[PDB]
Amino acid sequence: KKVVLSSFSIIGDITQNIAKDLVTVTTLVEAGNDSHSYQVTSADAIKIQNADLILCNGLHLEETYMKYFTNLKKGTKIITVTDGINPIGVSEDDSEPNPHAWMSLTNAMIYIENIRKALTALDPSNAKKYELNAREYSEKIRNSILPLKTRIEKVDPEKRWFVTSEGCLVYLAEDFGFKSLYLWPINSRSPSMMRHAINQMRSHKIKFIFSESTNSDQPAKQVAYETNASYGGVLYVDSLSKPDGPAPTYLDLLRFSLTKIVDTLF
């Protein structure tokens, strides 16, 4: 039985829905651990050696721990599951890529397709099962998320802003046709970015700013105070929640976070 290692919980869960126990799906950065800054342990090194296929986000998500993906089993490839996704930079222009491509309905389909493709090349005798599984999961995501997009698209053009702490929604904004404002591009910053967000929120009359499940809510609340806006609450973006939490799957993560976003716009 083949072993497929996903770099973090979001990719692991997507892969599980496509493979459905045809392969063993493992995860490097488990839910609750930090996808942007991870220390690979000795036990993790065993997962890496056992991997017949390694599934990474790319867009530099794994840059600080890519060095551990060495001395690999012969034939084991590292697949970048964001292939075909136009990067969005961390600056406001050339700059490093923002890694959070999975916060997008469109990109969900691309993650799924790339994983289907890689699983099929790894395990070609199960091609028909991966094909079926990938379509079913794609439809499942679409059925849950599209009604949220439909509500979101009713927002008036003046209020088309996602304001967050980390720049975690830049791909969602591009996907749905919103503008995004944030305090720092990637979780572990700067006074000027905070000042810029405060001025932009006042200039555009923005009413809400969120924080997220793995960072502090204090900067968002301070910005809310200084802008006469409201704190929007906590979104899930960088990790699945614990199993008894609100976002224990990728589908649930998208559904929860987008629901919470719509429920502040209306």
- Cβ of residue 167: shortest distance to Zn ion, in angstroms? 8
Q: Which is nearer to Zn ion, 62 or 238 (CB)?
A: 238
95: left (phi over 0), alpha (psi -120 to 50) or beta: beta
186 vs 19, 99, 203, CA distance in Å?
Answer: 30, 8, 24
Q: Which residues bind Zn ion (CB under 5 A)?
A: 187, 238
Q: Which is nearer to Zn ion, 15 or 187 (CB)?
A: 187
Q: Which is nearer to Zn ion, 134 or 173 (CB)?
A: 173
Gyration radius of the chain over CA positions: 19
- Cβ of residue 102: shortest distance to Zn ion, in angstroms? 10
Strand partners of residue 78: 54
For CA atoms 124, 109, 255, 91, the dihedral sign is: positive
DSSP assignment of 147-174 equals HHHHHHTTS-GGG-EEEEEESTTHHHHH
Q: How far apart are CA 237 and CA 214, in angstroms?
A: 9
Q: Which is nearer to Zn ion, 187 or 211 (CB)?
A: 187
Asked if residue 204 belongs to a known ligand binding site, the reply is no
Asked if residue 166 belongs to a known ligand binding site, the reply is yes
Asked if residue 36 belongs to a known ligand binding site, the reply is yes
- Cβ of residue 36: shortest distance to Zn ion, in angstroms? 6
- Cβ of residue 61: shortest distance to Zn ion, in angstroms? 8
Asked if residue 62 belongs to a known ligand binding site, the reply is no
Binding residues for Mn(2+): 36, 100, 166, 238
Binding residues: 36, 100, 166, 238
